[PDB]
């Protein structure tokens, strides 16, 4: 906004802003027993099995 005092005039301006992503990583660890993974494949035998 210009005005009538002794101040210098104002040229038009311009702004340039640079933004960037930030990577994030997540990891969870599961253990599974070897007998558990095995007997999911071994055959049905008896009602207690």
């Amino acid at each position: 906004i210009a005005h009538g005092d002794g101040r210098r005039p104002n040229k038009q301006r311009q702004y340039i802003v640079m933004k960037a992503c930030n990577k994030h990583h997540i990891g969870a660890e599961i253990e599974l027993a070897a007998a558990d993974i095995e007997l999911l494949f071994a055959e049905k035998e008896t009602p207690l099995d």
Binding site: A34, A35, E38, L39
Partner: protein, 66 residues
Amino acid sequence: GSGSGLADFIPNLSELMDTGEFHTLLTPVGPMVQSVHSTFVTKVTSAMKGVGLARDEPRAHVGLTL
């Protein structure tokens, strides 16, 4: 016993310790898996090269006990 139940098999226990040959005569084999025991003779199945499968408990692994 007092120790002479085993030392009668090796009559060289005094002399293998002097010259130092006793470490050359042992070969480490590995942990037990199964022992089927009789009166005069005991059968022993041990494990080399990895984790031996347990006999009596299924789906199980015999670890080494020290």
